[PDB]
């Protein structure tokens, strides 16, 4: 998973 909730990972 991607732990950064303040950026779009996709």
């Amino acid at each position: 998973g991607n732990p950064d909730p303040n950026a779009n990972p996709n």
Partner: antibody, heavy 122, light 109 residues
Framework: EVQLVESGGGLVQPGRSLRLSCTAS????????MSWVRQAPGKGLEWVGF??????????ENPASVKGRFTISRDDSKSIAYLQMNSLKTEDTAVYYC?????????????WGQGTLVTVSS | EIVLTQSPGTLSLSPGERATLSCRAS???????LAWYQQKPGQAPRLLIY???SRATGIPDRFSGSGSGTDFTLTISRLEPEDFAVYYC?????????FGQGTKVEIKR
């Protein structure tokens, strides 16, 4: 004043589903990621997922330990975050907290609601 | 996952004394992604320190956080009656986000 009013908790049968609501006020709800954290009686804190802002894609992340049973969604027009919990087990009995994820490069959990107790039992 | 082990389990101290709380990570964590929370019984947690060392708003000067790598510390330099509580560390730099098991700072009488 930041308010994160959880509702929808209470008693639920093992195996059933329950949707929690977090009615937010006192801030620009649409700007923030929101996260749910739970605390089983007598135990510590466990993260059970977050959802990003619409500007950041609006997608969720959940811990593998929950085995895909939980879904987080948001309604920006009503400033409500949801936690949909399926296939509930007695181990899911806990106080469930709604939290606001802070903006910027250190995304800590800046604000926490009172939490709502979910009791999974027959 | 990154396991956070806190020590000690319970710290019994008198008001005015200094409390030192430890948080050990199973692998290294960037200090930007470590936070500390305070929780009292019947109450929700509240943020104390974020980014290992930055105080949240309204947190008095007697709270300070430090550390890097796998070892992080929360120091409460001169305990006031309202500082006695359980303290949790948290990392949010790796998925899943994880919390330590908590350290109880109880008032010694």
């Amino acid at each position: 004043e930041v308010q994160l009013v959880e509702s929808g908790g209470g008693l639920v049968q093992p195996g059933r589903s329950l949707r929690l609501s977090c009615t937010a006020s006192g801030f620009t709800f649409g700007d923030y990621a929101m996260s749910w954290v739970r605390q089983a009686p007598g135990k510590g804190l466990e993260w059970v997922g977050f959802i990003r802002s619409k500007a950041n894609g609006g997608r969720t992340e959940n811990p593998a330990s929950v085995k895909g049973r939980f879904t987080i969604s948001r309604d920006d027009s009503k400033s409500i975050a949801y936690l949909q919990m399926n296939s509930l087990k007695t181990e899911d009995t806990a106080v469930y907290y709604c939290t606001r994820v802070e903006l910027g490069s250190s995304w800590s959990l800046g604000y926490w609601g009172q939490g709502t107790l979910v009791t999974v039992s027959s | 996952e990154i396991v956070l082990t806190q020590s000690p389990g319970t710290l019994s101290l008198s008001p005015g004394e200094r409390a030192t709380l430890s948080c050990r990570a199973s692998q290294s964590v960037s200090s930007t992604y470590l936070a500390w929370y305070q929780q009292k019984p019947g109450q929700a947690p509240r943020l104390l320190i974020y980014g290992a060392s930055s105080r949240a708003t309204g947190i008095p000067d007697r709270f300070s956080g430090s550390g890097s790598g796998t070892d992080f510390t929360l120091t409460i330099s001169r305990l006031e009656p309202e500082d006695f509580a359980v303290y949790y560390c948290q990392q949010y730099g790796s998925s899943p986000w994880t919390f330590g098991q908590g350290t109880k700072v109880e008032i010694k009488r």
